[PDB]
Structures are given as C-alpha cells and as structure tokens.
Amino acid sequence: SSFDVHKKCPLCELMFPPNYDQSKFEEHVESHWKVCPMCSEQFPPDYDQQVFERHVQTHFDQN
C-alpha cells in the first residue's frame, strides 16, 4: 500500500513522483506550450497557432 499521488501532465503521458516539485511540473507542462523566443511569451496548447505565429513572426519584422 502507498499514496498514488502521481502528477501526470495532461500535455503528455509522463508520470511524476509525489516528491516532484510543482515548479518543475509547471516548467514541464509549460514546455509543451507554445512559447515565443523573441520575447518569452507563453501560449496554451488550445491557443491558435496562427495567432502565435503572428506574434512570434511579429518579432522578426521589427527589432
């Protein structure tokens, strides 16, 4: 017997131990999210790639 409090990231199929730091989970979960490298913005998986690409691309048409 033991606590099965395994945190599973909805974005993937990976199971994390109960001693897993939430902060690390946030980063992992966010890792799957669409993030702009020109400013460092986070875009949810449900977001529209068109809007994201426009935002990221917006960073290429202006320095």
Known binder of ligand: residue 28?
yes
In terms of CB distance, is 38 or 51 closer to Zn ion? Answer: 38
Task: In whole angstroms, give the CA distance from residue 25 to residue 27.
Answer: 5
Task: In whole angstroms, give the CA distance from residue 53 to residue 14.
Answer: 27
Neighbours of 5 (CB within 10 A): 10
Give the nearest distance from C-beta 17 to Zn ion in angstroms.
14
Q: Binding site residues, as ranges?
A: 9, 12, 28, 32, 36, 39, 55, 59
Query: Residue ranges for the binding site for Zn(2+)?
Result: 9, 12, 28, 32, 36, 39, 55, 59
